[model samples]
Target: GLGYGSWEIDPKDLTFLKELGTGQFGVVKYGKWRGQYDVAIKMIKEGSMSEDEFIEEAKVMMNLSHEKLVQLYGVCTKQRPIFIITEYMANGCLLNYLREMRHRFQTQQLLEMCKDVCEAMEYLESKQFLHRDLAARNCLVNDQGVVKVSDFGLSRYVLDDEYTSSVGSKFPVRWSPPEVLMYSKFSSKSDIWAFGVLMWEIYSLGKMPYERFTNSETAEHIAQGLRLYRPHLASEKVYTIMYSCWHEKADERPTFKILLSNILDVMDEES
Candidate 1:
């Protein structure tokens, strides 16, 4: 569409490879960082975003680093609706794993895969960051089964007085906690709630919550107390942990340390 244009890449430094894909926010492209490294470049849309928005993204990316976490490469500030670069995973998103080649992993092996996700989540929690959009699809797992959390566009710095804008992100309400869905407040607890929704997603193999309903219908269902269904896939111990994480009271959610311990125990037993 002419409403949105291709990224204005600096021909001198970056080389455009191909269009990777787009999400609700904007398009993503494969590009080179400098003359060498491959990176997935996210091109922001020219909506009402400001320079502060770009800096917010750059701030989170620049401040955090870990092997199991996605690395931010650089940014092209000269262009409108700027280009943000990060490490490109060859296998694509976690959605592909669960939907495409999932049978390769047995039930116990699937638990191992989820353990990697918890590690990735703990990494973010340790840094005092919250991935507002936590889910199986947002995670990228390499062949070795190490998981990295991707897509920080919906991410927020968890503070005592943080306000999240839900207009742009269009986060699925079924994945959100009650407070987040009803009040638009997202804390570490809300993040944990989203993690439980992620658990549901993993268990369902990338099926959207109540896909039988239309978008408006699903939203209404959530408003009336419906949530993403959790089946028997979540082990008993972990299901208890997930119950605490998705607690509507917010204060009832366990800290990441507690969640971390359970994840390690599950990993050791399954591995």
Candidate 2:
């Protein structure tokens, strides 16, 4: 029934605490809502993005509920510098978490991280939603060390051809599939491709994808059927699952549902 009003937060109840990080669109801050709940508030920069489209996409994203996803608790569009309030992750970005806690994680924990993201992606896929941007940086870690997918549907609000054009390539090149890199096409399959790279990031403990190559070079290599090498932490079976996500043909790639089942099987075997 789209209970949109419930998600409209009162600005007076929000208090900014500290700056979390800045992105192309806005500054993220760790905040307190009503002096009770901890939250992450994204203060959208004026003129940096389209307000209409962002609100529209956010409305749709609000309906996408899952434990593995960062919940969109509400929005503050009644004033300037629109605010996006969501559940705060204590451990912050997954990329930084991996790098900082690299020595502390076991292979099993890494596999679990992959499984968590696959579960979230599967839910999104079922809803016919495509996460145009899916990466370790777009994910977050909780105090309990749980990973949750964030920034859902945000890329759609951004200019679609920003990457394909000469505007300095804001595109996620390393996480993109051949279709996305060549034609600027995006689909659930492309998300699958990004998921594969994310798994590689997990195993590599946050190493940059295609570390030795330029963005253009990486695209060329991917088109030529070159794929990321398996991290030493990944076993053959795990690598096989990752490789399957990189099939040149989109239809040849496994669905998130299948990927989840496969990962569960792997986890079972490991246990």
Candidate 3:
């Protein structure tokens, strides 16, 4: 909603502000349009992927839009290294924020950030788009700690209109649901399962247990009925709410709408 779905600047009119990050996908550079209006450009670097891969990614990314989701404004694929221009997030990612929370943000700020994320999740699900790859690092926050869901490279369609699915999920064991990791059948229920993981990621302030395990081993644990326990440091209500999210059966997990309702409930209590 910030950028308003318009390409305000020409392709060559942008100036690189700073290199925000780098990963297996490519590089993220904070840039500006005509010396104003901050933006982020994710470049699909040469040798990073094939033409068909970029085409597939572009097709998926262009279709997704939510008020709290990173707005994909325009793309520059004519050049050697393709560029994906998006609304810039000032405070960087949730993963970075969690690791340095003591020095960076207060407890109330963190609580509001979780609200922002849960709101975004509600919007995403309402649009029939299940964020199959939800994770801490995939969220970008503004200065006010408004969390915008990012990185749709691994996202798969699971809406009422989705007729078929292709491509293996290559699941992240720690952040994925049991059904997804077990057989890659990622539905909205599995998304709620991942929501439980995201809540843990938020409340635990980035600490992860059994992070070194393989997906196969993780699935075995999930099949045997193990919900990731939230530490005592977490708010009692948040623990209860998230634990309910990981209910033994996949279909039993709360809907995103219910998750958003619980967030409002917690906020009311905190106030």
Task: Tell me the lDDT of candidate 2.
Answer: 0.84
Task: Please provide, for model 1 over 1-271, each residue's C-alpha lDDT reduced to its tens digit, 9 standing for 90 to 100.
Answer: 3332233235357788898787645798877767788878777676534556556567556767777778776666665777767777777788777887636556676666666677777878888877767777688766566667887655442221222444333545556766765677778887787777776677666777677876557667766765554566666666766666755578878876777797778767756
TM values, all candidates: 0.79, 0.93, 0.82
How would you encode candidate 2's per-residue C-alpha lDDT over 1-271 as one tens digit per residue?
A: 2443765888888888889888877688898888899999888787666788787776677788899999998888878988888998998888888898645888999999998998898898888987777898999999998999988777655653664342246667788888876676777788888898999999999999999999888878988998888899999999999999888899999999899989999899988
Q: Give the TM-score of candidate 3.
A: 0.82
Q: Score each candidate by Cα lDDT.
A: 0.68, 0.84, 0.70
Candidate 2 residue-wise lDDT at 198 = 92
The prediction achieving the highest TM-score against the true structure is 2
Question: After best superposition, candidate 2 residue 231: deviation in angstroms?
Answer: 0.7
Q: Which is superior by lDDT, 1 or 2? A: 2
**Clash pairs detected, candidate 1:** none
What lDDT would candidate 1 get against the real structure?
Answer: 0.68
TM-score, candidate 1, is: 0.79
Which 10 successive residues of model 1 have the least lDDT summed?
155-164
Give the range where candidate 2 is weakest over 10 consecutive residues by summed lDDT.
Answer: 159-168
